[PDB]
């Protein structure tokens, strides 16, 4: 049977584009498409696709559950067995739900986190989807309670593969392949096992306006970047690490609150070191 | 002694042709004994030699879990590699890993190994000291920095000194009558005319184990190591191997040519000649 795939993503916004490819007998040409309820009834009046099928711009009519069959002339039937199924889900059709992490978006290696999707719209289902992955969104039935529908997605044990930017979506009864606008995104970052850095203040953590204070993140480990986070919930600051004469790697953030710093590496934004010890400014 | 255990992983992306795939195979010396393939409907580590089949369910369950985790890790590593090399997500790429341990006659560790490659070239390798890395390029140097910060070499060293040796010892015992019993080659020489002036002499070795063997042609005692056609050693399909060595000789001079065979299954080295 053929291998059917959606590119670049099976979860796709209205107005966007997605291409279905049907790989069979080491080629991508000559195939027909079918959707889940009409299984032996080829779509587009039996259109025989000569190459990958580009849907662009994407409309809600494209949402659905597809299989393909490849041409097979010198065989009993004209065609192959049905491919694996690919579900095209079209987003942007309802108000967006909300997504939050419990207890938070920074998740220790090996531990678990809950990503809760919720809405005051009654969604029959919720979908959780990590950015860039071809992994099919996770689906859960919504649970109704006190004027909201919601679902709890359990994520972990935490590893790099589970780390990244997540969005959640709802769908309503009778249009299960039509998704809401995405929730605001949540960056879920794995921390550890890389060794924790050191945090310090120069000249010190005691400051009175208006004098300058710089916080320095330092490690013997060759981190490429440092992240300064303040428990007060401003989005972390990031700076390149600079190698020092005594071979440490350090970044200086010129600026109260309680701070921590984390190291990270080039091309690797969702995995950070264990957190430094806390520092009160 | 001496013996080795090695695991070989191949992790491959193939956008539009299939899901990324992870295959692992395990060897003791030249004998494969386990395999895991992520494409299987219900992937499990599975036996590929009879002497491992009576290992208990806890072994299979544990190895299966380990392979599933390694498969996830290497699928993600393929993504990471794309970023490191600024490559498009349309192309197909391969990560390969081989690791394991060599032990002496006494069952004690002689050497540990852990090497990885990306698209068929060296990527990063554990050094002989089992405490430091050699990175082949700048991307691999990123991987090196992570592994140093995470103390990976210490964990791997612990594996190579402990479990790897202990289990290799167990398997060598489980399979003693096959793994520790060399099979000498059955040998013969064939003669094939080329012209009415020249002919080929071919020295054959068949049905031997282990794969290590030496076939040489001499002409009055001088190796023709420069004028010998030597075929790659090949599997017979029954856990034995085959090889041949050929030399082109002038007609009527066949008798000054000797084939010398060296293998552990042989009491004494063989010296054969065509008649």
């Amino acid at each position: 049977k053929p291998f059917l795939s959606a590119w670049p993503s099976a979860v796709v916004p209205r107005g966007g584009h997605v291409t279905l490819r049907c790989h069979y007998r080491h080629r991508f040409n000559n195939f027909m498409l079918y959707k889940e309820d009409r299984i032996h009834i080829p779509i587009f009046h039996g259109r025989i696709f000569q190459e990958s099928f580009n849907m662009s711009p994407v409309t809600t009519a494209h949402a659905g559950n597809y299989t393909c069959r490849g041409s097979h002339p010198h065989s009993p039937t004209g065609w192959s067995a049905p491919s694996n199924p690919v579900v095209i889900m079209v987003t942007g059709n309802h108000r967006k739900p909300s997504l939050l992490a419990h207890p938070g978006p920074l998740v220790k290696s090996g531990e678990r986190v809950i990503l809760q999707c919720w809405s005051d719209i009654m969604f029959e289902h919720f979908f959780l989807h990590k950015e860039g992955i071809s992994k099919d969104p996770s689906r859960l039935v919504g649970q109704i309670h006190d004027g909201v529908s919601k679902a709890n997605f359990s994520i972990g044990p935490m590893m790099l593969a589970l780390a990244g930017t997540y969005r959640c979506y709802g769908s309503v009864t009778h249009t299960p392949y039509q998704l809401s606008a995405p929730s605001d995104p949540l960056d879920i970052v794995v921390t550890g096992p890389y060794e924790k850095p050191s945090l310090s203040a120069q000249p010190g953590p005691k400051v009175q306006a208006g004098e300058s204070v710089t916080l320095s993140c330092s490690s013997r480990s060759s981190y490429d970047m440092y992240h300064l986070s303040r428990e007060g919930g401003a989005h972390e600051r990031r700076l390149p690490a600079v190698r020092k004469v005594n071979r440490t790697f350090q970044a200086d953030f010129p600026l109260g609150g309680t701070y921590r710093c984390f190291g990270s590496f080039r091309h690797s934004p969702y995995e950070w070191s264990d957190p430094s010890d806390p520092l009160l400014v | 002694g001496s013996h080795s255990m090695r695991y070989f992983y191949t992790a491959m992306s193939r956008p539009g042709r299939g899901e990324p795939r992870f295959i692992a195979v395990g060897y003791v010396d030249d004998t494969q004994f386990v395999r895991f393939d992520s494409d299987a409907a219900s992937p499990r580590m599975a036996p590929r030699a009879p002497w491992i089949e009576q290992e208990g369910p806890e072994y299979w369950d544990g190895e299966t879990r380990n392979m599933k985790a390694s498969a996830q890790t290497y699928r993600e590593n393929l993504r990471t590699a794309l970023r490191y090399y600024n490559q498009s997500e349309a192309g197909s790429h391969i990560i390969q890993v081989m690791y394991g341990c060599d032990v002496g006659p006494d069952g004690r560790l002689l050497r540990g190994h852990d090497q990885s490659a990306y698209d068929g070239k060296d990527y990063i390798a554990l050094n002989e000291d089992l405490s430091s890395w050699t990175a082949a390029d700048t991307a691999a140097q990123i991987t090196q920095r992570k592994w140093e910060a995470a103390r990976v070499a210490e964990q791997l060293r612990a594996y190579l000194e402990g479990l790897c040796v202990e289990w290799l010892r167990r398997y060598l015992e489980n399979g003693k009558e096959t793994l520790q019993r060399a099979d000498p080659p059955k040998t013969h020489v064939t003669h094939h005319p080329i012209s009415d002036h020249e002919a080929t002499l071919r020295c054959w070795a068949l049905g031997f184990y282990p794969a290590e063997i030496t076939l040489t042609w001499q002409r009055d005692g001088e190796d023709q190591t420069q004028d010998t056609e030597l075929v790659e050693t090949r599997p017979a399909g029954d856990r034995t191997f085959q090889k041949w060595a050929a030399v082109v000789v002038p007609s009527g001079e066949e008798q000054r040519y000797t084939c010398h065979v060296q293998h552990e299954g042989l009491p004494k080295p063989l010296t054969l000649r065509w008649e």
Partner: peptide
């Protein structure tokens, strides 16, 4: 027995 050590690039 296979290595239990994670090798994340």
């Amino acid at each position: 027995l296979s290595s239990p050590v994670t090798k994340s690039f």
